[PDB]
Amino acid sequence: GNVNFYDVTSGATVTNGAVSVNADNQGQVNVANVVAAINSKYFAAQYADKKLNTRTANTEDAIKAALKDQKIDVNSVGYFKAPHTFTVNVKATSNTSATLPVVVTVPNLE
Amino acid sequence: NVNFYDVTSGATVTNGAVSVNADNQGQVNVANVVAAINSKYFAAQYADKKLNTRTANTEDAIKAALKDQKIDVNSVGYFKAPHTFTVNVKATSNTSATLPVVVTVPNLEHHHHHH
Numbered sequence: 001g002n003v004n005f006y007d008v009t010s011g012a013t014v015t016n017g018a019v020s021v022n023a024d025n026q027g028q029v030n031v032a033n034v035v036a037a038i039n040s041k042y043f044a045a046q047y048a049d050k051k052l053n054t055r056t057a058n059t060e061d062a063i064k065a066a067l068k069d070q071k072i073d074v075n076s077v078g079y080f081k082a083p084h085t086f087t088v089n090v091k092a093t094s095n096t097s098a099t100l101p102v103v104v105t106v107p108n109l110e
Numbered sequence: 111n112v113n114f115y116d117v118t119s120g121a122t123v124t125n126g127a128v129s130v131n132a133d134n135q136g137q138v139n140v141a142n143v144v145a146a147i148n149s150k151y152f153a154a155q156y157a158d159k160k161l162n163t164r165t166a167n168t169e170d171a172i173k174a175a176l177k178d179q180k181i182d183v184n185s186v187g188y189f190k191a192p193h194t195f196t197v198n199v200k201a202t203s204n205t206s207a208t209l210p211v212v213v214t215v216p217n218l219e220h221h222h223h224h225h
């Protein structure tokens with residue numbers, strides 16, 4: 001009945017997530033690359049009747065909101081100066097909500 | 111890669127357990143054990159955000175468990191219930207998994223809070 005988050009590859013339910021994203025040599029990251037990393041690794045679904053019904057997460061919005069809470073601006077094409085780490089609260093809602101806290105690490109900052 | 115899952119929650123299960131009541135004569139029917147197990151647990155192969163259900167051999171597993179306990183089942187599926195026994199339910203892969211299920215018959219327990 002509830003939306004849960006799941007590991008894309010195993011299908012196991014998850015409560016906490018983590019991904020790594022490499023910055024470019026100038027320490028910049030694009031939001032679209034964070035979105036792709038998170039959404040490739042984790043998905044949301046409502047389970048019923050031996051079936052998973054996928055639900056869209058607000059990954060992009062969640063990333064920008066996490067960055068703004070760390071006082072990091074993103075430009076109109078999605079670039080920002082990355083911190084070493086930030087936590088994204090990825091949300092998916094039900095039809096009839098779940099939040100996955102995903103720690104993003106940017107490991108290659110000078 | 112085949113796993114067993116709880117029918118209602120969808121959570122993966124390693125070891126299952128069910129309770130099945132005997133009749134007044136202390137007999138249980140295989141069909142009631144089948145229904146108890148299969149109503150609660152199912153097998154599936156997970157891939158690509160999708161569950162692909164697989165058939166379990168529940169009835170055969172029950173009869174094999176009962177045979178190994180030297181418990182005879184009659185032609186209409188009735189047997190004299192032992193207190194608790196384990197059934198090894200199997201499902202096969204298309205690309206293969208066993209769920210041990212503990213079956214207990216509660217009307218035949220030696221200890222009980224009731225008076």
Ligand SMILES: NC(=O)c1cccnc1
Pocket residue numbers: 018019020021037038040041
């Ligand atoms: N941990 C990760 O950065 C990650 C991202 C996507 C898939 N698998 C792992």
